Structures are given as structure tokens and as C-alpha cells.
Amino acid sequence: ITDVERFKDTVTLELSCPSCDKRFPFGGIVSSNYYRVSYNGLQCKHCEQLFTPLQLTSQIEHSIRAHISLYYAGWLQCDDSTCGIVTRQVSVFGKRCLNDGCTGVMRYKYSDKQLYNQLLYFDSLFDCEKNKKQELKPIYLPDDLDYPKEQLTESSIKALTEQNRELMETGRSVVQKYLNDCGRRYVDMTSIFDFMLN
Amino acid sequence: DAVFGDRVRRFQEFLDTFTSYRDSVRSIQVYNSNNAANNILPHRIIISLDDLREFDRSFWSGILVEPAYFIPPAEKALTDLADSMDDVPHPNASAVSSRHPWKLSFKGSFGAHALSPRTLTAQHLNKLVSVEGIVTKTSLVRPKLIRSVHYAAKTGRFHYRDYTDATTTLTTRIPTPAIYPTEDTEGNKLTTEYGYSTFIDHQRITVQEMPEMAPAGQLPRSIDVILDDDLVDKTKPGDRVNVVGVFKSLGAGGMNQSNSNTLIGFKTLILGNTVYPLHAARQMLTDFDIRNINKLSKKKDIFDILSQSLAPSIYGHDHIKKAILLMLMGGVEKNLENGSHLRGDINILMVGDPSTAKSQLLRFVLNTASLAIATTGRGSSGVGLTAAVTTRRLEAGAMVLADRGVVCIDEFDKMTDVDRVAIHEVMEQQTVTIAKAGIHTTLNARCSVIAAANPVFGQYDVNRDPHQNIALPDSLLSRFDLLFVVTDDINEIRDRSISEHVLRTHRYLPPGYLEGEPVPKLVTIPFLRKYVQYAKERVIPQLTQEAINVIVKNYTDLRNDDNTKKSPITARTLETLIRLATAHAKVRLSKTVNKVDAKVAANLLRFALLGED
Amino acid sequence: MSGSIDVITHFGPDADKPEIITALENLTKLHALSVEDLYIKWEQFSNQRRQTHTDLTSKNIDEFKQFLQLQMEKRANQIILDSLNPENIEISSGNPNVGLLSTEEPSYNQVKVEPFYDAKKYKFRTMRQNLQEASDVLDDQIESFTKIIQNHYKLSPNDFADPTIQSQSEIYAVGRIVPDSPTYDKFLNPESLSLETSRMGGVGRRVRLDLSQVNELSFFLGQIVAFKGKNANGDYFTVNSILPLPYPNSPVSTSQELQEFQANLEGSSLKVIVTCGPYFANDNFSLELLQEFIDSINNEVKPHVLIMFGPFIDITHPLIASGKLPNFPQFKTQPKTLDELFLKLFTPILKTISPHIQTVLIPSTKDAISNHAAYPQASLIRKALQLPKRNFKCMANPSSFQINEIYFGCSNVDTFKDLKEVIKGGTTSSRYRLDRVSEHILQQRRYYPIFPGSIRTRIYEHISGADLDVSYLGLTEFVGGFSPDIMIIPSELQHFARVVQNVVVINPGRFIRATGNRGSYAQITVQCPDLEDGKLTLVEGEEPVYLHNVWKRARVDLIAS
Amino acid sequence: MGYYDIDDVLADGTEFPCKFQYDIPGLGYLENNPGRPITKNTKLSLPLWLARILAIVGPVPFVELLPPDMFSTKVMNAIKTDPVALDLHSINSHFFSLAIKWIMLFSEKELANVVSELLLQRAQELNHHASSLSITNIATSTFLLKLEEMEKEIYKKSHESYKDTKRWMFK
Amino acid sequence: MFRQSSEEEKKLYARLYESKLSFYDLPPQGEITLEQFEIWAIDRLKILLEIESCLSRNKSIKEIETIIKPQFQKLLPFNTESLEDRKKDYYSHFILRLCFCRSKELREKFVRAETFLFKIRFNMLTSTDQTKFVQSLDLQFISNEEKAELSHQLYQTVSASLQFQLNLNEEHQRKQYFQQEKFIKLPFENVIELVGNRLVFLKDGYAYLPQFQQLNLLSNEFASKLNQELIKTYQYLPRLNEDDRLLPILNHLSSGYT
Ligand SMILES: Nc1ncnc2c1ncn2[C@@H]1O[C@H](COP(=O)(O)OP(=O)(O)NP(=O)(O)O)[C@@H](O)[C@H]1O
Numbered sequence A: 001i002t003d004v005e006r007f008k009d010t011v012t013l014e015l016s017c018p019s020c021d022k023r024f025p026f027g028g029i030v031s032s033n034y035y036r037v038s039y040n041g042l043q044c045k046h047c048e049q050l051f052t053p054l055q056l057t058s059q060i061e062h063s064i065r066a067h068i069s070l071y072y073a074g075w076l077q078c079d080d081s082t083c084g085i086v087t088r089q090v091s092v093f094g095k096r097c098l099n100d101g102c103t104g105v106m107r108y109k110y111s112d113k114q115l116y117n118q119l120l121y122f123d124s125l126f127d128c129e130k131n132k133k134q135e136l137k138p139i140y141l142p143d144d145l146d147y148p149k150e151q152l153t154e155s156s157i158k159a160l161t162e163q164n165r166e167l168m169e170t171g172r173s174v175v176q177k178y179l180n181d182c183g184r185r186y187v188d189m190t191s192i193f194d195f196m197l198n
Numbered sequence B: 001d002a003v004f005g006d007r008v009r010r011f012q013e014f015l016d017t018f019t020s021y022r023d024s025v026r027s028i029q030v031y032n033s034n035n036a037a038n039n040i041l042p043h044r045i046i047i048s049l050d051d052l053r054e055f056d057r058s059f060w061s062g063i064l065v066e067p068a069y070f071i072p073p074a075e076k077a078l079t080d081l082a083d084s085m086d087d088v089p090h091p092n093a094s095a096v097s098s099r100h101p102w103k104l105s106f107k108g109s110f111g112a113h114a115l116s117p118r119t120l121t122a123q124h125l126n127k128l129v130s131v132e133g134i135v136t137k138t139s140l141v142r143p144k145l146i147r148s149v150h151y152a153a154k155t156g157r158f159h160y161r162d163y164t165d166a167t168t169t170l171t172t173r174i175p176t177p178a179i180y181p182t183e184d185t186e187g188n189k190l191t192t193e194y195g196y197s198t199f200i201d202h203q204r205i206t207v208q209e210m211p212e213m214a215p216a217g218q219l220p221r222s223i224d225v226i227l228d229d230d231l232v233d234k235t236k237p238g239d240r241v242n243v244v245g246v247f248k249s250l251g252a253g254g255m256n257q258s259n260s261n262t263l264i265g266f267k268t269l270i271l272g273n274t275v276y277p278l279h280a281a282r283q284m285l286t287d288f289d290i291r292n293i294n295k296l297s298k299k300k301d302i303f304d305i306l307s308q309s310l311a312p313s314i315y316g317h318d319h320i321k322k323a324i325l326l327m328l329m330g331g332v333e334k335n336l337e338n339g340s341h342l343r344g345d346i347n348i349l350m351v352g353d354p355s356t357a358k359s360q361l362l363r364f365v366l367n368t369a370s371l372a373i374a375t376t377g378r379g380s381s382g383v384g385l386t387a388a389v390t391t392r393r394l395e396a397g398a399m400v401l402a403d404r405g406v407v408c409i410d411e412f413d414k415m416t417d418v419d420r421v422a423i424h425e426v427m428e429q430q431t432v433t434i435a436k437a438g439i440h441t442t443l444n445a446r447c448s449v450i451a452a453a454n455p456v457f458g459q460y461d462v463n464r465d466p467h468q469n470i471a472l473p474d475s476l477l478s479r480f481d482l483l484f485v486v487t488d489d490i491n492e493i494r495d496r497s498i499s500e501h502v503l504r505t506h507r508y509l510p511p512g513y514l515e516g517e518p519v520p521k522l523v524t525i526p527f528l529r530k531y532v533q534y535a536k537e538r539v540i541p542q543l544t545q546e547a548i549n550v551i552v553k554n555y556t557d558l559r560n561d562d563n564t565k566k567s568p569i570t571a572r573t574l575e576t577l578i579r580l581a582t583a584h585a586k587v588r589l590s591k592t593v594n595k596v597d598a599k600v601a602a603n604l605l606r607f608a609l610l611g612e613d
Numbered sequence C: 001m002s003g004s005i006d007v008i009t010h011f012g013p014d015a016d017k018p019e020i021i022t023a024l025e026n027l028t029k030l031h032a033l034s035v036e037d038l039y040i041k042w043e044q045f046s047n048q049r050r051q052t053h054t055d056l057t058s059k060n061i062d063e064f065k066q067f068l069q070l071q072m073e074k075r076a077n078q079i080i081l082d083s084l085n086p087e088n089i090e091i092s093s094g095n096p097n098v099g100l101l102s103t104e105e106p107s108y109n110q111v112k113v114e115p116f117y118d119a120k121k122y123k124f125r126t127m128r129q130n131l132q133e134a135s136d137v138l139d140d141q142i143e144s145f146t147k148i149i150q151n152h153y154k155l156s157p158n159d160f161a162d163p164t165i166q167s168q169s170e171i172y173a174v175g176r177i178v179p180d181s182p183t184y185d186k187f188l189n190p191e192s193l194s195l196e197t198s199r200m201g202g203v204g205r206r207v208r209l210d211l212s213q214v215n216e217l218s219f220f221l222g223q224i225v226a227f228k229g230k231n232a233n234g235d236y237f238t239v240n241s242i243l244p245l246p247y248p249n250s251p252v253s254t255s256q257e258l259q260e261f262q263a264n265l266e267g268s269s270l271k272v273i274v275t276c277g278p279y280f281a282n283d284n285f286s287l288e289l290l291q292e293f294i295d296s297i298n299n300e301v302k303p304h305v306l307i308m309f310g311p312f313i314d315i316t317h318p319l320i321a322s323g324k325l326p327n328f329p330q331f332k333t334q335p336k337t338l339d340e341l342f343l344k345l346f347t348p349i350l351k352t353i354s355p356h357i358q359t360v361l362i363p364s365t366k367d368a369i370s371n372h373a374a375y376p377q378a379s380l381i382r383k384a385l386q387l388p389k390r391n392f393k394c395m396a397n398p399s400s401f402q403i404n405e406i407y408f409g410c411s412n413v414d415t416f417k418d419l420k421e422v423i424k425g426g427t428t429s430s431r432y433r434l435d436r437v438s439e440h441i442l443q444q445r446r447y448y449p450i451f452p453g454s455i456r457t458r459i460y461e462h463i464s465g466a467d468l469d470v471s472y473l474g475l476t477e478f479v480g481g482f483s484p485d486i487m488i489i490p491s492e493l494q495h496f497a498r499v500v501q502n503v504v505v506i507n508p509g510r511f512i513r514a515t516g517n518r519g520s521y522a523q524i525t526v527q528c529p530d531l532e533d534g535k536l537t538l539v540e541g542e543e544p545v546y547l548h549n550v551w552k553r554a555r556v557d558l559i560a561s
Numbered sequence D: 001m002g003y004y005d006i007d008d009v010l011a012d013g014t015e016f017p018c019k020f021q022y023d024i025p026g027l028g029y030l031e032n033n034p035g036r037p038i039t040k041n042t043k044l045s046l047p048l049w050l051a052r053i054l055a056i057v058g059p060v061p062f063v064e065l066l067p068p069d070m071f072s073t074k075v076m077n078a079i080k081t082d083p084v085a086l087d088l089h090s091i092n093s094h095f096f097s098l099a100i101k102w103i104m105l106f107s108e109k110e111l112a113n114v115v116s117e118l119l120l121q122r123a124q125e126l127n128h129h130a131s132s133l134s135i136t137n138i139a140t141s142t143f144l145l146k147l148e149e150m151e152k153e154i155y156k157k158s159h160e161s162y163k164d165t166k167r168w169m170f171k
Numbered sequence E: 001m002f003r004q005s006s007e008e009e010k011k012l013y014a015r016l017y018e019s020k021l022s023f024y025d026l027p028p029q030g031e032i033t034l035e036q037f038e039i040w041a042i043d044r045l046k047i048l049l050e051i052e053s054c055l056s057r058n059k060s061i062k063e064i065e066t067i068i069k070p071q072f073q074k075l076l077p078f079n080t081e082s083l084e085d086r087k088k089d090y091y092s093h094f095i096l097r098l099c100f101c102r103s104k105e106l107r108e109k110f111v112r113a114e115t116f117l118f119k120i121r122f123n124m125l126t127s128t129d130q131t132k133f134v135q136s137l138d139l140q141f142i143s144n145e146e147k148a149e150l151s152h153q154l155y156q157t158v159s160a161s162l163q164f165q166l167n168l169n170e171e172h173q174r175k176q177y178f179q180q181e182k183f184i185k186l187p188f189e190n191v192i193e194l195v196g197n198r199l200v201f202l203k204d205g206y207a208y209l210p211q212f213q214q215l216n217l218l219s220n221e222f223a224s225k226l227n228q229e230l231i232k233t234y235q236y237l238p239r240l241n242e243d244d245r246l247l248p249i250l251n252h253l254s255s256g257y258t
């Protein structure tokens, strides 16, 4: 599955400039009208402020923690189209709808799948190989008003990714801190082989 | 028989583990494949024996003690590795059946088996050994048949067969009669297809222990070596060389019925696997050297730094040092389209009083030039200094041996008139030609000459003419670019400075020794040699109009103005000016000669010629 | 002129062809190296190829560009405000070993801090909540309380019945307080409350509560409750009386244990300091106040134990949220992550704490240094914070641990702020709110009995909340089934210290205010357990055990930070 | 490693290469010029009793130790191919003392394994030449010119023991 | 004379790959990722797909070995000390059990491809490794007297095979090898493929098999035990259905064979 298809429903990472407060979407090492990736790191095009590694990594971590807190807010939604009730209340049956007479199934409005895909989308933005191969989810379409006029060459993208390898690895480590604690990841063979326990 | 396969497998594991040898195979293959579509590199690889020790000790000792049983399967595995990698399709007829596998070579840590010809002993037979010595003889190159291909006229089938001889294989097989088959098994008459058959080159040499190790004036001892394929003609007599190969025996040793009563012993040889030279001149630059050489060249006064770094132990004589540096750089040799030749190399002469460091300074050039031959004027004859006949064969002299180098001649004044006149060709035409009984040939001699002499009266007499003081013909003095006169004038402060200088010199101690034990900035000589090599190879300054404007004016003024000048001025003086300007531009690493270079060359020539600046 | 002559003065005059000039100019502009640097690297390129004819052609320049990129990537690879019991108990003198330089092992006066929970159970993977598992936990809570109520009041199992079914006879019903509308709009009155039953008790159905016959009540969402009443009409369950939930038992110790703990302190009083984050203001990351506090801790206060609640690095800090983190000129190498920021700011300061002071660290769900972002929360990784093993202990959140005989119950979630009560009657309203909240915490036997957890929203966008992992809420219950002697739940509300049902309930307050002004911390002095002074209550049994009665023999001082 | 041991006193005087990390006034006499400073990244050869301290005392210490030639890779390969044939006396007179000192200084693990094998393999031929008593000179003498100063003492104290036992027995 | 004197998972796989080949005998333990599950299964699936493609193209063992051996270093390494490679190999096999236990056709195709890969990897071994691997599996040689009594018949049986399979054209070499060769006695039904080609000597319902042959017995035991395990794996597929995240991957894996 491509990153475009996998991350279709993910929220784009927005970074706020520490100097001029301008918010812009971050799409890795790509052409953008709001930021430029130089040999020194991320730079805002509005005021030419260079981002320190801490300023970038803290914003990434804040976005991750915001998504985790949104997940644990526990909003549930009924899948019945007629009812469509949204509540944080959980019945003792869990999946039973709390509206009287409704047979629909309650589900998390922000599922663990969506959170996991969001965290991977953040992880993909700081994967050096994906940046070199230009396999990231695009933050602009060709028909968008904010589509950049000047496009970075493939050689330029590879050179900038090599020059900024430390920064990308640091941000990816910040993302990987939480992905290692996500329960959706691993598969336990010890429990799985219950037939040999027959 | 089964053990052969397992050894091939084990060496395949070795080749897969240490990946730096795969890159060698692939790089040689792609290089050869590229230029084939338009030199070709040999199908040979050198392995470090230490890697094979650390990978598998049993295979390491097997190679090093039983080479006949371990070298062939490893070579087979290397051929399999190179064959499996991708290769150009549709090979020609000759390529299809070349019978040409890859081959191995070794380096590093032979231990006990590192030997010399004196100490090679019967205990070491069939072991893999390394020897050191001097080459004394070399045979002519000959081809050798190993395979032949035949076409059957009626059936249209191509046949072939293989041949072997005792020196062609490490293992031993029944010898082959070297006969070409004329007729098929089924009676069809055969034809031999040259060009599809395979032949290889062969050469024998002899290696002797170095004379420095000979005991008690005893007879020296020597070994014969066999070379083939790529190793041919990579040595000549007089080379100091280190050879790696298998030490083996041959022949029947008289046990096939003979009159000797078998007192005579068996014959022995070394089969050459790898050859390395010994330095006893050339150096190869690293990247850091290129960076330093380019950075240093932009100093304001590089010429002063480099010139003063030549022979720092000799006080004074700045201009002679600068002239020697410009000699070591040299001009640019021209060959015009109609075959005409214009000289490039600079010759220098210096004459002076006794004890004034002439021979000591002349000795310095011999130990910093890349190729240099030294001789004394009276210890050499004209034929010996140029060329001589022998048996008809013609043998080279000293000026012919140093072709693209420098030749140093001390005690030049003692050379007889009959010997001197042989040199008039070599210093301008740069060739030697002989016309004697049964011979006519021309030889090349492109060197630069530097020499020293004493004046006629024992010390230079200013109260007599320079011709009276310097008894040489005008036609000879014209051929020297720069002529220097030097004298020992007595003066208080000069004497004090020189005496303090030599006394400071004699108090040196080398680094690693305690006192009493027996044994501006100056660039080191090992760096200066690299600088000279790089500048001579990589930059070829072209002349410019601004330099010519200076050169023409200086030449015409110098020739016509009446002065007590100490050398005849001729058309060769203009060439001297051009050469010196080009050499000074080459010191600067400039791609073009500028006005500054011509100005400096003129100022040096004026000092040497008219004696004052 | 300039680029052309610069090339021609380093490269030969053969470069005068404008395509060659353009290519070399492109190289120097691409890679920022000067013309002479390009000439030097071209000379490097000319080496090692056996190519004496390294001519300055277009193809050679293309190979030189490839060489330059290879060299580039290879170079990259190379490279006192308030007080509880002030009149009866004096402030402790503290640990006498604090301030002594001696390397000698701290032999006698060793306050023992021991966790009273299974740390492995808190190391569960987050961000995966099965709705069925959560619902199982919620149902098991109702069933456990039903068993407790049945045993306490000696009721038969047949006395309990479904409150959602019409019945003319009075029945007993246990369930969870839930809103009458699933889409309720943040304000609950007594008339909008419903009771959710267990799967066994009422098949999980909800019934509206008619509380007209009840004069005094205090209810909150997620509370487990017990009612005696009837459903006469089938629409609402009329509550006739509320059954108070029994309080959990108090911890006890044997005479031998109390004598051992008395010998350990040599009859002196225990001193415990409790602080709660944040430890820097909202507009900077200055830890000057924390440094001054630690110097006071080491030189004047000299406590036996220091308890520090997070957040140490609050992820919801305004500078972190806005990305306006300052440069730290005091550091040679700037931090790159918030973990490195902790290691550069907090770790040098915390290491200056005396080794004789046992330091307990409890995380917050807002702490950037904790990857376990859910309540219940795993402990901080002490090695990752580079703190010494001798005197630092990282505990979970909530954490139950024992200091000598005293059982401490700690939860770093703001239960006091989050718990919103639906109250009726004059007597209930006249009572102090935090007393009622503490009693709700003790009766429910869980540090955070609210369900669904609180959320904070801004103009709506979700900011933060309790962040409850519902499947693991069993770890939030009181360990061992008894209340703590001292319960510490930090809250944004005003600091207090109170005795509620023989449990000392403490909110130390924030260490520093948002404006940078000094906040508050709690100093707890507990007198030594003495079998002869009468402050301990003997409980008769097979083996005689003693109630600790820490509330009779504890002083809590709320002190400006 | 006693204080008054002559061999330890003499072994500490061997020079090792060094590089500086601070410029210091007046210590140019180490560079044989008392009237000048030392400057950062200057390289000098200093005796071990001084470099052993200047490498430790601060932070960044004053001097960094460069890998000496007597522990180069070529020597290690020569050791590992054939330890018995090796001329350790030419490499350094006090090899096995400086080896232990360097191992203590840097806590090397692999160098210890190499050196232990070297000692154990050479002890065999040392015992062989010790045991061989006349009832020959060249065959013994060729090997005994490649012993360290360390090994000569063991050889002498073994030979004398065997000789004394033989003399007592056949008496 | 003188004289002197989870970790368990890693030790388990070191034990399992000491022989360099395994019958894939035991239940894995611990954890790996779901991405690893998919990718490892796809790698082994690619190798087995090429094996089945070459067999459908009727290519010989040598050609298949030439085609497949370069793919191990990319997809499924063999003869390796790496724990990652060993776990990759083991887990990929166990995953394709769950993919291909679903039907008789899938079971037959998977057994065929995996047994041929087993044969290929066994050929890569040294004789010592083959001996140790066979001995580890707990796998009757005839007496010297019985060999002497049947020496004429056994030599007549194997003499052509010695010439063609072991290249022993010289009868002297064949006699020496036969003098050094051992023979195995078992019922003729166990080696019936060799019986049909008359490659073994039959006496009283027992087939006499030389030691240099008989690898078909090893590969047939591998195939039979794999088939029985697949039948077992089929019976408890309802337990696999408890995790929905694995079923799309297995459906994708099986789609390439349908
Ligand atoms: N600056 C100096 N000037 C002159 N002589 C020097 C100087 N420094 C050293 N010498 C010594 O002078 C001696 C004579 O040097 P040498 O090169 O033989 O002079 P010379 O010109 O060759 N005399 P001659 O052989 O009669 O022609 C040597 O012993 C040198 O070491």
C-alpha cells in the first residue's frame, strides 16, 4: 500500500514558526511556499528563521501527544446511519448502542487504527529513504493554489536528505518512542501455538 | 578425488565472506568490457594471506605447505565466481574456447618461508616460498602450445585436444608428444585452425643473492625462475626484486640409466606466482599532497622558499641554488609538424677556486633528482660516455643511460680534448649516432648536464682575460645555458659567518641517539621531490605576448651593447631566456608565462653573464 | 568576466568554450565550493584512473560531477500557608545524616521505602483499547461492589433485583450513575440521573432515577451506588433510601514491626516533603526556584523522604505547544529532544540531592519524559533519566508504597478538580466539597472513580484530559483492599491538608504558579509509632495488630515553595 | 613491579608518541627550545613516565597518546603467523613489560589474548633448549639471540636448575 | 601428566539452525512485527513461486539451483549465523503453513515447493553437515557378513550408478569405493521410486540401498511430516480467526497460487 493510500485520512503535520507565529504544513524534504529545507535545517520562508532541532522535535511530540489524548478521550459513534449518536458513555456491553431501540454497533470515533496510521505518517515524514524516493504523502496537489512554482530536483532532494540526516533521524526517534509503546504492533508466537498445548 | 570439490566449496565460502575481492573481479570485467566496444587488464587477483588465515586456518596452512593440492581448486573457484557474473553476449570463435581461467597472487606475512638464494634448502621443496635477490640473466620470450583446434572436412565437426609439460602445471601428469593429429578416429582428414588454438608466453630468468650479503669473498649462489602469461618482461638485468612462487624439482636425475652412477642431483626451479620490485625513483601522491601542493603555490615568494630549502647545509650561493631549481624543473620540448625538433633542457657550468663547495654542491643534485648518473671527468672516455661497440651489438654509455634525467660531471677540466668533442652532439641534438664496422644506428640521449671545473692558473686571475682563465673552445661554452664564476675572497665577517655556520652544522645529533652514541621556513626534501614531480608532470606553461615583449628587448640589448661579458652571445642565448622563463612559470604552477617570469629570467641571466646585479 | 577568468586562471585556456564555463559554473553554484576548490577536486579526480588524457571535455566533467557526489556522500558517511495539627505535634528535625560528607554506609537511620504494587502490571502497551475489554472492566466494577454490599449489609442474593423491571415490592439495586441522555450537554441535575445495571443484575439496561424521596445526596458520573427502592410504573426507579457504601479497612501492623520501625528512627519523627509540578513558569524554563528548594532541602529541612509528582516537562506547556522554545546559552550543546532537555536541566539539579534523602518520582500523563501516555501509567525509566539508583525510586501513577509502617496512596491525576458532584439538600451543601470528594474516593476504593474521564477543550478542539485506558482501570483501585494512611492527589485547586475518615488527604498544590510566583509544597511530620502513648488502637485477634492512626500523630504543613 | 627494580626503572624511560591539547607557555624545552611555548596539536615523543601522567591529569587532559609503532598491525600479523621464529629482541628490548603497562593503561582485551599466545608458544622452545645438556653450540645460539631481556632470566634460571640436578645425579 | 579442572528463544534458534537445516519441528515463541510477518512470508513465497515455475518448465535440479541460489542472499539467506536470518526462515515457513493448509491443492503445492527447496539446501551442505543433520533427526545398516554374501548382487546393482552418478569410470575405482561403501536394508515399499527404476537390489521384500543414495527418504519424510502438520494446522484454523489483521495477508499470499 502506498503512503498516499495508507495516510489518506491522517491529519497533516502543521508546524508553527517560533519567530513569526505562521503555521504551515510540513511534508518532509519537498518544495513548499512556506518553508525551505537548507543544509542547516528547516527554515521558514516568511521570516527566514532557522528551526533548532528542539523546536521541531517538541512540536512533533506535542502533535503526537495531542493525538494520543484525543484517542483516550473515548468518543464513541454508532454505526447505524439513522441513529449516528456520538457519546463518550460506554455501556457494560460496550458495543450496544445507548439510544433506546437502536440495534447499531458502537465504535470508537478515533480508532486505534487511525492513531497508528497517524503515528506512522509522522514517522514517514522523517524517513530519509522515503524522502529521497519522494514516496511521502503530498501536502500539495498540482491544482492547489499553494502548489510551489519551483520544484526541487531529485539530486537536490538526495543532497538535502544526506545533509539533514541527523535532524531527520532525531525526529524519527521521537516518533519511534511512541510507536514502540503502541499495542497494535506485535504478534506473540508463544500464545499463538496453543495447539501444541493441546 | 572427492576432496577436490569440498576445497572448491570452502574457497567459495571464503570469496563470499570477504567481499573486497568480488569488487576487484567486477571492476576488471566492466573495465575490459567498456573499451572492447571502442590496454586490457589481466585476469589476475592478489589476495591477502592474513584474511585467509583468519577465515580458516586449515586452508591457510594447506595453501602454504601443500600448494599443489590447494592452489588449483581455489583458482577454479575464482574462475567460477568471475564466470557467473554477467558478461557480454555472442562471443567470437576464439573467445568461446580460450582455455583462459583467472589466476591468483599473494601478499603478506610469509613467516619462516621468507628466504634468500643462499639459504634455500632441500627441506623447502614443494613449499610456497618468497626469495629476494638481483636479476642477472633473462631469456628471450617464446610462445608455448597448450591447446589446438581442428575442423573435420566431411562431417563439419570441430575437434580439439590439450597438451601439458612439467612446468605448466603444479600437479604431475603424463607428458604429451607435441604432435598435431592429421586424421580423425573415423578416417576423415583434419585441418588445423590457427587463431582458434591457444598459445601462451614463456620466459626464464635467474636471480642471485645480493653482493652485500656475500661471505668471505665466497662464490655467490643463484636460482632460476619461470614466468608466463602476464609476468613476462616485467624485469631486466640489474633489478633488485622479490619473487613469490612454488619451489619444485624436475627430471629423472640420472636414475634413468646414465654413466654418472647417480652422484649428480635432481634439477630444481621456482615457478613464478608473483613478482614485486624493491626500491634500493618514483613516488605516488595522495590527495593530501595535491591539496598541500596547490595551497603552497599561492605564497608570494615560493621561489625563494624552495630555492633556499635546497642544500641548507651549504652557506651562500643563492643564485646557483635558484639555477639548479630551474634546471630541475626544465623547459618544454617542442616537436614541429615537419619533424623539426627544438631543445628544452637546461645545462649549467660552474668554475671556481679550490675548496669553494663546487663538488659538495654538485653532490646534492645526485640525491634529489629522480634519475641521475655521476662521473668524474678523467675517469671516463668518449665512447664510454656516449656509446661503444661489442660482440654486432652496440652498448650504451652514461649519457645514453640517463635519457630523461641529469648527468653530473666532476673534474671537468681534466677531460682530454679527444673525449670532450664526443659531447657536442648530445647537448644540442640529444642523440648519439655511430658509424663503425658493421653498425649504423641512432640512439636517444635527452638529459641535462651539470658540471664543475677548476680555472687554468689554479685560482681565477681577474687580471687576465676570461678566455685565458677558462681554456675551452667557444663552441662548447655556447652550449651551457648558465656559466658561474665563484671565488674564495678573504674577508673578516664572511670568514666568521662561514666558520660559525659549519661549526653549527657539525654539532647536529640525529633524533634517536643519546649524546656520544655512534650513529623563514624550509620545506622538507621528501615534500620538495613530490612538488617537483607534480609540477613537471601536470603543468605545461604556454608563452604569451607580454613575456615576448620583454624577451626580445633584453636579447637585442644584451647582444649588441659592448661590455666585458664572460661568455659568447649567440642565437642560443634567446633559447636560454625562453627556457628559463618557462621553467620559472612552471615553478609558479601557472598555465601561462607572464611578464614576471621573463623579468626574473632576465635578471638571473644578467647576473650570471655580466657578473653584477 | 569573473567566473570565466577565474576558471581560465585555474583551468587552462581550453575552458574558454562557453559550455565548459557553464558546466563548471553550475558545479560551483551547486556545491558552494570556489573555482579553485573545484580545480583542486578536479585534480583529485584526474588521479588514480591511468588517464593522462584527463581532458576538460563535457563527458569528463560529467564523470567529475559523479566523482564529486561520491566524495560528498563519502564525507557525509565519514562525518507556612496552612497547617494540619500544628498545636499537638512539633515539626520534625529531619534526617540527621543529611549534610554529612561521609562515604560510610548509612547504617542505622534507614527509612525503608517499599512499593506496594506489581510494577509489571503497569507495563502494558498503550493506544490499543478494546471496547469489549473496557466494558468488561466496567461491568466487573458493579459486580464487585454488589458483592461488597451484600456482605456488608448481610443481604440475600434474592434481595437484589432488576430496577428496570416493574415491581411493586421494594428491591435492592446496585449500578453506576449515568446521565439520562447519552448526548448530555455537560450539566447534570438530580432529575437527569440514571442507573446503569450490570449484565447479570439488569442486562446492562439503564433506568431513570426519581430522587424526590431523598433529601440529602451527593452523586457524580461513574459512581457505583446502591439503592433501596421500587419501579412501580416501569419508567423510573423511585429511590427510597441510599445505602452508604462501606469504607475499606485501615492498614495494620504487628507489635514487632512497630518496634522495629521505632528502633530504625531512634524515636525521632519521620519527615516527608511532597512537591508537584510544573517546576518552571509558563513563559520560561528557569529552574532557579527548584535549585533554591533543593539547597534548602539539603541544608535546612533535611527530610527523610522527598516525593516529587510530575509533570517535569509538561507537554501542554505554552512554549512547547507554540514551538517557541528558547536557546539555552548555558549549554555547550543544545538539547535536541525534550528528553535531552530533561537530561540537561533537571538531571544535574536532582543529582545534588543528598544520598541520604530517598527521592520518589511519580509521573504525570502530561509528562513528555514518559512514553506511557495513559492513566494508569507506568513508572519513569530511572536509567534513561541518568538518576542514581541509591536514593531515587521511580513509581507508577497511581502508586501505593510503604514508608516504614505508613501506607502512602499517590495518584497524579486531578480527581478533586475533575469530580463534579450533583448535590441536593442543605446539610450536604453546607459541608466542604473536598471532604465529600475524598469520601467518594475512599468509598469507591479507586483514586480516579470518574467515568467518562474529564476532558479539556478550547474554542471545539481537544487539548488534554484524564486519558484513561479503560481496560486497565483495575490498577487504579486501592491495593490490598484497604485505604492508605496518607492519600496524596495533587490538584490545580488550592492546597489543603485534611483528615477524612482517618485518612490524611493532602493536595500539596503546584510548586510554581503560571506567572512565575512561588507555589506551595507539603511538609509531613509523622511522630514515631509508640505502643505506650495510647495513640495506637489495638485490634484484638489471633495475632494482636495495631491501627496506625497516622491522622492522630501526623502534622502536615503547606509551605510556600 | 617494585620501586627499586632496575629493569622497571629502565623500561619506563622508553619514548612514546604524543599530541598536545593545550598551548602552554615556557614548556618548549620538551621541544628542545626552553624559550618558547608549546602549541596545540603539536606532536612530540616523550618518555613513558611523563606521558603516563600527562595523558590522565585534566575535562580534557593535556596530552593524547598516539598508537606506537611497536604495536602496529604488521607486528601483530607476524606474531600470529609464527611466534617461534620472531625476532622480538630487534622489535623492542623490553616488549613484555611495555605490553603489560599498555594493557593496564587502556584495558585492551584482544592484545592480551595475542600476547598470552605468544608467550605460551615461545616458552616451549625455550624449555627445549634449556633441557639439552652436553655430555650443539650453533643450533642453540641461533635461537637464543632472539630472546627478550625478560626471557633470558627464565632461560638462565631453568638451565642452571637442570644442570645442577644432572651434576648431583651422575657425580 | 598435567591437567586443568528472551535468551531462551535465541538459544532455541541457535540449536535449531546448528544443523543448518530443520524439519521446522517446534513452536516459535516471543514476538515479531506484523510488517515482518507479511514481508517474510512474501519472500519465502517468491522463492517457492520460482521453484514451482521452473518445475512447471521441467528444468533440472542443476538449473533450478543456478536460478534459486542467488535469491537466498536477497530473500531467504541460508548457511548463516545471523539470528535475524534464522528467525526469518523459520517464521516464514510457519506463516506459509497457515496460508497453505487451507485446501488439498494448496497443501500439495506448498509441500512440493518446500520439499524441493529442502532438497536444494541439502545439496548445498557439506557431507559432515548432512551427516550431523541426519543424525539429529534420529534417523539399519547391513552387517559386513551380509554384504559379503550379497556382494555380487549389490555390486551388479550399483556399478552403473557408481560410474554415472559418482563419475567412477574405472572399474578399479568402483571396486575400491564398493569395498568402502555401506548399505541400508529396509522394506521395498519405502523406496519404491528407486525400485521402479531398478536402482536398488531386492531380496525377500527388502530393498538394499547404498549410503551415497537415499536422500529421497529424507525429503519424503520431510514432505510427509509437513503434510501431517498442515493437516493439523488446518484443523485449528478457527483459532487463527480471532485476529482479523492476519486474514487479509494470508488471502493475499494464497491468491498468487489460485
Ligand atoms: N659554505 C661552505 N663554503 C665552502 N666550503 C664549505 C662550506 N660548507 C662546507 N664546506 C666544506 O668545504 C669542503 C670543500 O668542498 P668541495 O665541494 O670539495 O669544494 P671543491 O669546490 O670541490 N674543491 P675542489 O675539489 O678542489 O674543486 C668540504 O669539506 C665541505 O664540507
Ligand SMILES: [Mg+2]
Residues within 6 Å of the ligand: B355, B358, B359, B360
Ligand atoms: Mg672538492
